[PDB]
Design a protein around this ligand. Structure first.
Ligand SMILES: N[C@@H](Cc1ccccc1)C(=O)O
Length: 222
């Protein structure tokens, strides 16, 4: 029925939401599967996402995704939070993700001073790092269970070694579980993910993380 169809205009915001989870020490990855799927949809854009969903036979009521402001007190001081209009993810859950991310960011500040771009929550490759785990999970979905979980974790520790040094919240077990859950609960995300992975993998050049993603995705075929 009602599905969030993020467009290109919110892609940066979703990438930062992925980044916020990636910098959180012992992050609660309950919504990471859904957030990574929202990121993949924002890369495809609303028109292509709806086309994929309808072509696959799904009944879709598209919910447009805008950025909005919510006010909330922190230490008795009013803070302004930018959130997305998502039918699948409440304002409260999004704000809690940011609050927990800010606590981990303060610990990083105390240890190393201001944080370098590649260790920040707004690094351009944050959404793609999350989708690297999804590429691994998609290879083990046919089993009808989570038996492939151990192999997912082993491959992620090897292939994503550099990204794990950058991010304390890059916990392959928890992120892989969140994707297994998102794909079991909402199988239409499998179609979306596969179309994303194909379109992503054919792109020329790009970042180191884009190359890692293309390698993992293509390894789910050969
Ligand atoms: N806006 C600040 C503080 C912040 C840290 C982590 C998450 C959200 C906000 C920064 O990006 O440096």
């Amino acid at each position: 029925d009602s599905i969030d169809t993020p467009n290109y205009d919110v892609q940066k915001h979703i990438n930062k939401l992925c980044g916020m989870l990636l910098i959180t020490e012992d992050a609660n990855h309950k919504f990471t599967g859904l957030i990574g799927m929202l990121y993949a949809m924002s890369r495809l854009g609303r028109e292509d996402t709806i086309k994929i969903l309808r072509d696959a036979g799904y009944h879709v009521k598209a919910n447009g995704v805008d950025v909005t402001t919510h006010r909330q007190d922190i230490n008795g001081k009013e803070m302004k939070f930018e959130v997305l209009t998502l039918a699948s993810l409440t304002t409260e859950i999004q704000i809690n993700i940011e609050i927990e991310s800010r606590k981990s960011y303060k610990k990083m500040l105390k240890e190393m001073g201001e944080v370098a771009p590649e260790y920040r929550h707004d690094s351009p490759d944050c959404g793609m790092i999350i989708l690297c785990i999804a590429a691994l999970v998609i290879t083990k979905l046919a089993a009808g269970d989570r038996s492939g979980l151990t192999a997912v974790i082993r491959r992620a520790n090897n292939v994503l070694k550099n990204e794990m040094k950058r991010y304390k919240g890059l916990l392959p077990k928890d992120i892989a579980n969140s994707f297994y859950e998102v794909f079991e609960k909402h199988p239409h995300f499998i179609d979306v993910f596969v179309h994303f992975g194909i379109a992503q993998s054919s792109t020329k050049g790009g970042s180191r993380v884009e190359g890692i993603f293309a390698g993992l995705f293509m390894n789910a075929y050969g």
